[PDB]
Amino acid sequence: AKQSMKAREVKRVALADKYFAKRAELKAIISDVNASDEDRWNAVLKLQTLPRDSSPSRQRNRCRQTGRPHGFLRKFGLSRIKVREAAMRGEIPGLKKASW
Amino acid sequence: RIRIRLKAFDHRLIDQATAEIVETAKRTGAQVRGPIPLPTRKERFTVLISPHVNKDARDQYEIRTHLRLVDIVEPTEKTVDALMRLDLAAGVDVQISL
Amino acid sequence: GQKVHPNGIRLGIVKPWNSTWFANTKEFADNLDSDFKVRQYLTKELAKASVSRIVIERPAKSIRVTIHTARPGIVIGKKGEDVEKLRKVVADIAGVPAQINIAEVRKPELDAKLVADSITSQLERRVMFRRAMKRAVQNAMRLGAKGIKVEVSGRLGGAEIARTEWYREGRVPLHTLRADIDYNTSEAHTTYGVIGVKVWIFKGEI
Amino acid sequence: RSLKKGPFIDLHLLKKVEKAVESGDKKPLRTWSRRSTIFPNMIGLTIAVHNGRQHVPVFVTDEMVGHKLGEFAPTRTYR
RNA sequence: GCGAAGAACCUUACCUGGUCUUGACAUCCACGGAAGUUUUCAGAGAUGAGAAUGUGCCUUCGGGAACCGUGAGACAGGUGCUGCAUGGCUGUCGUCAGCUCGUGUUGUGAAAUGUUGGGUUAAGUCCCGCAACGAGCGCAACCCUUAUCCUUUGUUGCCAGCGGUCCGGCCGGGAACUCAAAGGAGACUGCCAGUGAUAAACUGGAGGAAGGUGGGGAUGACGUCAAGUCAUCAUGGCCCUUACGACCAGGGCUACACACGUGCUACAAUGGCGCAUACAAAGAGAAGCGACCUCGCGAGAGCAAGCGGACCUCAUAAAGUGCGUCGUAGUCCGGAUUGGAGUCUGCAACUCGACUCCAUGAAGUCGGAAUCGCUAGUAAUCGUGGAUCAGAAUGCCACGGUG
């Protein structure tokens, strides 16, 4: 695996643990509504242009045996062929293929 | 009043999992009906057919889930402890209905 | 090319698997590193045993070993209780109780691991490579088989260069996926060359 | 048209447009944010906008209500 | 309309300038510092550094070295050049019918004969006859599967039989049936009649849910081609190594003074429109499918369900049918506007997203030398669902109705 992808993983997971203060997560609660008509602001976002690339985007868990994103299945964490090969051996917890 | 359910991805692991909740109470309560089988359902699943770079074709991938209601009805605090000890077991899934 | 890796990608096809084990994917590399470690200390107490292959199964809280031998006496030792050493060399590495099964090899002069040994031990004795190669085929094809190939490399017959030469009888389906080919590469490792033999055996599909 | 019914000015542009009236004390100040929106508060000043290799001056018209700074800065050499 | 199944910064191989150069990853030498977190100044930012909060680990925190700064010095780095260095991965003639081992006979021999001839087929395939025979491989068969019974299940699904009974799966209950499975059966030119050489083969007939190798897959016989790919890759050379490495943003690459093959649709009235409406398959889901009621001319947002996926929720399928109205009219034809309003996700909706309301009504009166596709559950026609993911495709994947 390329250090360029590993360095972006090491950034993407660290921007998910940069801020903990209740102003840095204000976009989870300030666009909330109970009633319509007229503007509320015009510029209450006073500490929310300082964050960069911290919002949840492009999150991956990949093929957990090889680290590859290619052809992996979300319900197993394995490749679209390893889901047979490991079940033919009985390794997958609670699942078997052939001769059972 | 509680009801409990058991799920498995194999037609036989589900029976040795029933052995940890029904036959652990064979001397510790009233009788329990032999398990009603229920439908195994279609729920068709698909995968890309070649290991790499082919995308014009997709294969079927045949898998089914077994669901059992086990006829055991309302549990004692001991049968709840036996059920929560099966919630600690891998390869199967237990569910509670209220 | 088109020689591929018979001990790699082809070995999972129409054949029983030599390992089966589950682990948490966050430790998969360490449990793959121990799949080699439980062989490393074991194949030294089989050093004389003419074993074609070993199988190591790691179920939950258990480890179970099968040895496929041409010589069942030399693995059980005096009074037939010395077989427990094959448990004690792996149970001391895995930290769990280990089981042992000794399995008999049918026709040990038709098994690829052992035919390559029976050629290497002749090339170490400086015999004419074609004689050993042709006798290995004329023996195996009379014990059974639908075809067999042998390829010898290194110092052929007293040659001044490494070289490679082969011999084949019957059919050897190397490009057919279901062929159940039995394979091995061996090396003699001498002062005067590496001196290698490769063998491909075909007995029937699936 | 705006964004979410209000005008908005972030610190990186606010620190440029509150230094200008009408004419400043030095040259028109420089910016690269062509994705920023200009509103009726910025009326009557000159600002210098990047083109990708140099900067060019633009002046905020009295008819301003809402435009992106990348739309009216002379950038594309065409023919 | 294809390279490696979603493109704003992202990804990206380009250009301009930044922010760096033992780099991020790594082995390692010395010296002053624990390392992180929080925040201010400067920059848009990659960062340049203080100030506070702090002194962990092993150890006797004498000391040590992760780790941080700073220097030295072998170096680290690259979906860069190249299948014209390889291996692997596959691609192709092609489901094509043909390729070998032990052999016979013939010729000086290349090689032939057989494998030719008479019948025939999906096929060197099956037969007839003959100087050729056995044994193998591919084909077929084998393996996978579908059209329909039988037995097993029997629930919160189904409800015929049975005792109640506005007679309702509703209660007692039942296994009859759809449903969801696993097995057992069924298909073999096999049985019957013809033609033919009462051979093979072929066309009919019966049987059944249904054949005329039942249809579609799986293949890798002997071999062809130095096909594609350094792009998951692994790796020998080459190239760049304070950079062609990388990392932040702006210009963009959905560009435009040139030239076109190939797309796709309207131009009604055996009907449309308005109103009332019938009958689906394949699908999606407690980090989800999204309701009711409220508001908005609407996107959507509020208050916030139902359901464990049969029943809830997405979602009263459309064509079609009936009545009333319309009348080749630029129509109720047809379809882009320029202006103004919004609704949503996000470093960003300018060029260039999704989604919605109001009006403008241009072109089109059916298309040139010409040219295209399917022989039946098919052509055409009329509708339906989904994945990917912050947001974003009638492209991409799939199915029923009429036939």
mmCIF file of C-alpha atoms in Angstrom, chain B residues 6 17 28 33 41 47 58 80:
data_model
loop_
_atom_site.group_PDB
_atom_site.id
_atom_site.type_symbol
_atom_site.label_atom_id
_atom_site.label_comp_id
_atom_site.label_asym_id
_atom_site.label_seq_id
_atom_site.Cartn_x
_atom_site.Cartn_y
_atom_site.Cartn_z
ATOM 1 C CA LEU B 6 -33.193 -16.572 17.127
ATOM 2 C CA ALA B 17 -27.999 -22.793 19.421
ATOM 3 C CA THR B 28 -36.720 -26.006 34.677
ATOM 4 C CA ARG B 33 -43.173 -27.338 20.947
ATOM 5 C CA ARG B 41 -37.077 -16.198 2.216
ATOM 6 C CA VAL B 47 -21.882 -10.049 -7.184
ATOM 7 C CA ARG B 58 -23.059 -10.040 -12.642
ATOM 8 C CA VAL B 80 -32.953 -14.257 30.557
#
